[PDB]
Design an enzyme around this catalytic site. Sequence first.
Site, PDB file in Angstrom:
ATOM      1  N   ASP A   1       0.832  -1.194   0.000  1.00  0.00           N
ATOM      2  CA  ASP A   1       0.000   0.000   0.000  1.00  0.00           C
ATOM      3  C   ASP A   1       0.870   1.249   0.000  1.00  0.00           C
ATOM      4  O   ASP A   1       1.756   1.402   0.846  1.00  0.00           O
ATOM      5  CB  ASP A   1      -0.916  -0.014   1.222  1.00  0.00           C
TER       6      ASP A   1
ATOM      7  N   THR B   1      -3.759   4.901  -4.055  1.00  0.00           N
ATOM      8  CA  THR B   1      -2.887   5.764  -3.273  1.00  0.00           C
ATOM      9  C   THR B   1      -1.487   5.881  -3.862  1.00  0.00           C
ATOM     10  O   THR B   1      -0.752   6.798  -3.489  1.00  0.00           O
ATOM     11  CB  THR B   1      -2.800   5.252  -1.841  1.00  0.00           C
ATOM     12  N   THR B   2      -1.097   4.974  -4.752  1.00  0.00           N
ATOM     13  CA  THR B   2       0.189   5.073  -5.431  1.00  0.00           C
ATOM     14  C   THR B   2       0.073   5.808  -6.760  1.00  0.00           C
ATOM     15  O   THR B   2       0.953   6.604  -7.117  1.00  0.00           O
ATOM     16  CB  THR B   2       0.768   3.677  -5.661  1.00  0.00           C
TER      17      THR B   2
ATOM     18  N   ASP C   1      -8.448  -2.559   1.244  1.00  0.00           N
ATOM     19  CA  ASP C   1      -8.475  -1.940  -0.080  1.00  0.00           C
ATOM     20  C   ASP C   1      -9.599  -2.525  -0.927  1.00  0.00           C
ATOM     21  O   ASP C   1     -10.375  -1.791  -1.553  1.00  0.00           O
ATOM     22  CB  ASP C   1      -7.129  -2.126  -0.778  1.00  0.00           C
TER      23      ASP C   1
END
Lengths: 48, 76, 52, 532, 183, 364, 528
Positions: free
Chosen positions: D54, D87-88, D391
């Site tokens: 994550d 989130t990346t 997630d």
Amino acid sequence: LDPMGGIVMTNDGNAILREIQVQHPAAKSMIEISRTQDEEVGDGTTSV
Amino acid sequence: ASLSLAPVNIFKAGADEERAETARLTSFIGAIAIGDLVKSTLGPKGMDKILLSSGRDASLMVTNDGATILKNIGVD
Amino acid sequence: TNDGATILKQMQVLHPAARMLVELSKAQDIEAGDGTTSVVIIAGSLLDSCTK
Amino acid sequence: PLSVFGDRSTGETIRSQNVMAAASIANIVKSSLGPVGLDKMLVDDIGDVTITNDGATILKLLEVEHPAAKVLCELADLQDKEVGDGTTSVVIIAAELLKNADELVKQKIHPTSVISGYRLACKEAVRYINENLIVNTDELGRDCLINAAKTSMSSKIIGINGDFFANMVVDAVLAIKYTDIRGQPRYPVNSVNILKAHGRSQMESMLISGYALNCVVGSQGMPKRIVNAKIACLDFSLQKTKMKLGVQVVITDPEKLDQIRQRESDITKERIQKILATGANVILTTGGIDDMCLKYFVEAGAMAVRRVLKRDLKRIAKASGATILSTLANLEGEETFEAAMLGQAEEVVQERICDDELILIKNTKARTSASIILRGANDFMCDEMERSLHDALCVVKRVLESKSVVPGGGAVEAALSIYLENYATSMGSREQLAIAEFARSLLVIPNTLAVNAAQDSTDLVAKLRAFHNEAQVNPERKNLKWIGLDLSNGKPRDNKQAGVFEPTIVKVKSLKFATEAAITILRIDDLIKLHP
Amino acid sequence: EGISVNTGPKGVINDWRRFKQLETEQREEQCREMERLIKKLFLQQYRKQRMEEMRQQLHFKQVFEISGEGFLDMIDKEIVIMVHIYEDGTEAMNGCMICLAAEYPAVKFCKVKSSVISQFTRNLLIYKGGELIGNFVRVTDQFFAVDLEAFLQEFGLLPEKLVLTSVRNSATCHSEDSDLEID
Amino acid sequence: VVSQYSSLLSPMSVNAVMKVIDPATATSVDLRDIKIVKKLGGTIDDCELVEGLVLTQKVSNSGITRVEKAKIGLIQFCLSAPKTDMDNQIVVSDYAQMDRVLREERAYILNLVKQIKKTGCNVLLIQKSILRDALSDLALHFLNKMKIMVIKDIEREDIEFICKTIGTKPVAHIDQFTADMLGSAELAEEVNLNGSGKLLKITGCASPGKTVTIVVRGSNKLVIEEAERSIHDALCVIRCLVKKRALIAGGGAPEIELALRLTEYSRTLSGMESYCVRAFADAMEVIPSTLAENAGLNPISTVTELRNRHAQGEKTAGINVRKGGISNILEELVVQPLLVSVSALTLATETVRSILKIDDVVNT
Amino acid sequence: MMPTPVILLKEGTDSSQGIPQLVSNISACQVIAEAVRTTLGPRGMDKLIVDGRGKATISNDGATILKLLDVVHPAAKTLVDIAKSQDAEVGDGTTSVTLLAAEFLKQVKPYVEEGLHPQIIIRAFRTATQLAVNKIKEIAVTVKKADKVEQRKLLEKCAMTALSSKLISQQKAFFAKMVVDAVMMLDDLLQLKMIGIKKVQGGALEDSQLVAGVAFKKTFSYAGFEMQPKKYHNPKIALLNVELELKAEKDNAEIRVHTVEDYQAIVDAEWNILYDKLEKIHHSGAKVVLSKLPIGDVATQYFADRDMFCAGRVPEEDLKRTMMACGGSIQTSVNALSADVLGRCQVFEETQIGGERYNFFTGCPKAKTCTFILRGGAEQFMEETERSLHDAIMIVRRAIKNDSVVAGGGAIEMELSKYLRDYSRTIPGKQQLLIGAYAKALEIIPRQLCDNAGFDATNILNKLRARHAQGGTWYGVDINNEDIADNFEAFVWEPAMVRINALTAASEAACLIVSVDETIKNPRSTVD
Ligand SMILES: Nc1ncnc2c1ncn2[C@@H]1O[C@H](COP(=O)(O)OP(=O)(O)O)[C@@H](O)[C@H]1O
Ligand SMILES: Nc1ncnc2c1ncn2[C@@H]1O[C@H](COP(=O)(O)OP(=O)(O)O)[C@@H](O)[C@H]1O
Ligand SMILES: Nc1ncnc2c1ncn2[C@@H]1O[C@H](COP(=O)(O)OP(=O)(O)O)[C@@H](O)[C@H]1O
Ligand SMILES: [Mg+2]
Ligand SMILES: [Mg+2]
Ligand SMILES: [Mg+2]
Ligand SMILES: [Mg+2]
């Protein structure tokens, strides 16, 4: 030879791996694997 | 903008400078000190000064001569 | 930030004239609210002309 | 002449420094993107090990000092909060946007024009996504949920077992469904208790059709299994009654001391007598229980659990129909406990999970609740499973709430790049360059996906761009919008048919947040760092 | 002589503060070190201590080894904090801290050499709220984990005493969004 | 930085100012009547102009939210066990009194809650207390049983704003808590900000007060603070329009006109004062140079063109960044109040005059 | 990793490999280019570097700036090396080489970051560079007329273009004419040591002059020097390598006498040896005597008594230059001082220049040398004037070799960029992106010119691109007119070899930098 002064004299895999301090995170993972195997079934700690 | 009082430093380390009022003050202080030193050795009733050298010889001299008094002193 | 008063107050200036300019920007913010950059620039330019 | 006690970098120096910081933050996590991504191991100063994929977790754990790096880290945190996925990708997109914007600025393009072009490009990208690339999930049935879960769980420790974990996630999310006022369904994820315990393989992870408590019964005397459970949820401690701070006991006739001391515990005795007389079988309280009261619960043949978490108690009460009682006081000033305050579950048991025990409140009535027990090789693996599972749960929630999904694997990015580079020819003269650079920046996602698999990134992205360009130009080739990247074989693939989906909200929020972060960083041209 | 210097030091206030911050850090370190550096310079056979010892082994990590800046800023921020000064009977003390740390998660056992901090070197500091509450120096004169436990409990410094769960339950703490049921 | 979000914030600022003052018979604007609430998350496009008031405090009464036809009551006393102002103790010498203490405390709390409920109140705001417990667990349970949404830990400084907005009158003793002291509102709802927080919003009030609330949203904290500062600047500008109602062109036009006219004025003087006034005009010419700079324009040529255009008679000619040249700016809608230029000039001249009367610095 | 009790390499060895080290190398080259960017063009600025001893060095030449930079990055040293290489081989373009190399690397950085194989980039660079060099050789303008006036004008224009970026650009026409006059007097090898450059402080730049002969500073005159006449109207110059003073005949010589008569004879013999040397010099008819070895006071007075001029300890290069300017021969022996070995000049004078005494040899029709006497206000002023004149001299010599020129001001760069883009449009596509990157990188020079001048670079580049695409070969940046113009008709000329070598060296540096995948730094030895 423990840091507390005691002596652990055994051929059990879990005890040997439990009384050893490591710095590499992979080694920590392997120690945790030994503990998991010992707790789940109690045997096969060296084999895993 | 003065040479010493400027945002940028223009001198080597230890290099001083004195502008108008300060330079006048220092010059007058030095001159007055010299004049007060030599005077009282003036006239028929003048008195003598003892000069103790700080060197290894530690030479001792008593004199009434202005040139001799002024020559053998450390002046900055 | 882009606010002149906020920029001036946020950074310590350490100099008397600079501090008076900071408080000038504060006063302009109090009376007007904007133009805090313009007033400081105007004061600086006025003193710059005062040099010559 | 400034006489400010601190450093000062201005102009191109600070702009390049900010771009350096953002690019370093991006390059930290660029290797954990897409199915061929790989996890990272974080070792703190004291020696704790955290293995995670994550991006939000990595950026939160890492120590960061440069303000622009802090901005990107907080951007990843915000993306995690509001969406839960991507989130990346948001961090990578923001950093590439800064890189290209700074390159434009170095060419004496004013930053305001670049910012305006970025805003226009972001608005047009969102509009084009909503009007052309979205896929309605109504006609896709249940397969859409499973495929979205599988796509989200790729690049995770539970990626290969997606066939099973996706069914598990979909069932868990559908279990907690509820409809609120004005008639829409809401899915309160984070109400699914995720319990971790090392032991058997991942395939032995259990979806509890009820609720799972990470506690134990208070005393060994009471039974560990009750079939017809009447849960009573309490929010007060059951101990010897101690009078409040304003009340003090003063004895002048010594004969009253024994009666006082007797009442001191008889009060709690009577309260428990009422609770047990209503018919209750299971008692859960957030406060403590001393041994004296545990004895009453043992004699009555009932289970009593102490120090239950407040949120766990609220979830149990809501699912079982019980009412939390902070006190036993009715509206006529008496201590009482009606039977209507009892929840009901058809089985409450205490199961042993790898040399440890936990209560399993199974099949509560008046509401269906779900809990997940994760079994892994060790603690680190279970933690990564929990993060990836959260997630996936968030992604399924987003899909169920907003019923639109978009093709995955960089199809959206390539289509947007083609459309934006085509549309930039009409807006202004320098915002033309800004929008073109926005379109180019959008292409970092397929490039990183390809390069992570050690494939020909240049050729693969060129093929994908050619496909999307021909789709946008040729009127009747609109079925090529879904062409994405197949990283297993390294060739373009119809991702809509392949089942690679993701919620539209992920892409839209990612674009908006990345654009705003890039604008915030790009607005700076001078840095003053006061000496501490 | 009466200079009453005008804007003289003003031209050098930047450098003056540059050295002022450094001397402030130096004096902070000196104040932290010196406040304790030289300022101080059958029931009878403990039948239950063996039982306490055998219960102590039933649980492992190690105590934190600290330079001077680390020692300063670990206690400056954020409970009782125990600091052990050793140079290389320190092994027995280290074992006692290791054994006590597990059973008392609240306490913050840690150790640091005196080299990073000449009478003190040749021949245990306890903090609470940023100030020293412990009053023990040269513990060699007055051993196992039970010895240290009783020694600290005599002066009431160890907080009073936990079940072992599966591994963990908590993930994050935020807005509830818990179970809701509406018509 | 919020220049891109101008079509949303400019009308928002204008409405915020116009909703807290009387359009006539107003000579100043109290900006403390426009509360700015900053909430992380979202983008600046999510900024709002809540008509009622927004409370960051969370609802203690879990499970009851979004009450309609709310009758808000604000209390300043404490709903807990009785406690006198001077030190008090209860002595128990018999178990009968030991039970009666709990019984009577429960009865007292129940009577308090019943009196509150009898007035039709369904939303309760409780002022923050530090001495005695403001809201006991028993009181909260009783209020929940009566279906009243309880909101505690209201700050002391916010009482005036809350009473001005909702219309509630504070109550400090239960004897005075009546229906007349209740602020009726259309809706009092607690909402969540898409997982970025929880906001309590009381929108729609009978006889609304002269206050508004602006909620600022942003992706990061720094842009939120800058958005708050920018909104404050816009509100201050509208206030500058409220007092000294005069508008002039911007874009460096007033500065260049000042430079030209002051140079001409200095031509009519003599001696050293003519030199000083000419230098003053030259200094005033700086702002147009700075505006021409930072925009990619040639500064000196642009300033000369502005001066020529103003000498031709174009008082409104100014720098046009959009076209990258010189044109009338009133067609570009670039105006600012007169009490910005006038204030800046006066304050800068005052500071310069003050500094010029300084000849020594003494270190204490 | 693991400790590996016995490790492979020495302790402290630092190794970096993969894409990250390549990106770092490209960034370092960018830093090196930025260190000299603002010196390019007629609007370029000087740079001042202070060494560890406090000595400053104000310079505009890119090679000098880079040499004064203590660059230690292994990848960055390549840019310094290619700048020095261009300085040595051509003499101009030391900034353009660094700018072009760094721009090539920057343009290929995006393709490197996505995993493109470096060999592909190297092949693309080699192909593009050879094509560009062929194009330059094809479109360069040459005049096959053998017209001396046209050749002289070409040399003057090339020198003016080379000079119009330095602090002497205000007097660039005057300096360029003087430089062209200087170089044309060299015979066939154009040796730089044959062009003396003397710097004398004080005086305006326009006071600097070129001597049609040789001039050098007065060299430690002995007693009796001021009695010698200081002007001759047809002197014969005796160039000698001889020590004219009383001294031991040989270092190992010893005299053993046992009679006072022999003692007196030995004394008179030493005196007679010295007087015999001096008499042999005097009967040669020479009036000016210059010697590499010291000339003593006795010889000085002897020559003064004969109305002769003497100057000992003349530097060897100055004697060689006097030889080549006057037409004599340096003699180590005075025994045969024929008229063949004697120099000849119209006028010799010992005048004063700014607080220094200088000897002037003018009126030498057969002179093959010259001498620059530069006047300035400071040491660094004259140093940078000398550097600028050196650049102009090298340009003039190279143009003498071949009169092939191209228009400057980015015109040739724009033409090459257009040609390379057109070529890249007709290839399969993997090479197309890289050749297009090369062509785009070729646009750095006009962009840097515009940025230095304060222009709007984007508009000028668009105008140049449109002009080249629609027809027009020599259109470049016009600095004064804010615009673009035909640079060939504006006489902004450069020799073709300057751009040829710049492209070749930049391509080689870029290929070398890209080809490296790993950097290893062994621990230092004997740090002390
Ligand atoms: N008498 C025997 N002959 C052959 N194999 C044996 C015998 N006894 C044990 N083994 C094998 O040797 C292994 C012993 O493993 P052990 O030391 O018990 O490992 P662990 O302690 O981890 O269980 C077992 O796998 C078992 O199958
Ligand atoms: N099976 C798949 N085939 C191709 N692409 C995929 C597949 N699964 C995921 N992707 C893509 O990989 C990208 C990276 O996802 P990932 O980085 O794991 O999510 P996050 O950004 O939340 O960490 C996503 O944009 C998605 O489109
Ligand atoms: N009059 C001029 N107008 C425009 N550009 C010029 C002019 N003279 C020279 N240039 C440009 O300046 C560049 C040379 O700059 P300079 O620093 O002197 O040498 P270098 O080639 O080492 O950079 C050449 O590319 C040339 O095109
Ligand atoms: Mg075994
Ligand atoms: Mg403003
Ligand atoms: Mg993901
Ligand atoms: Mg040149």
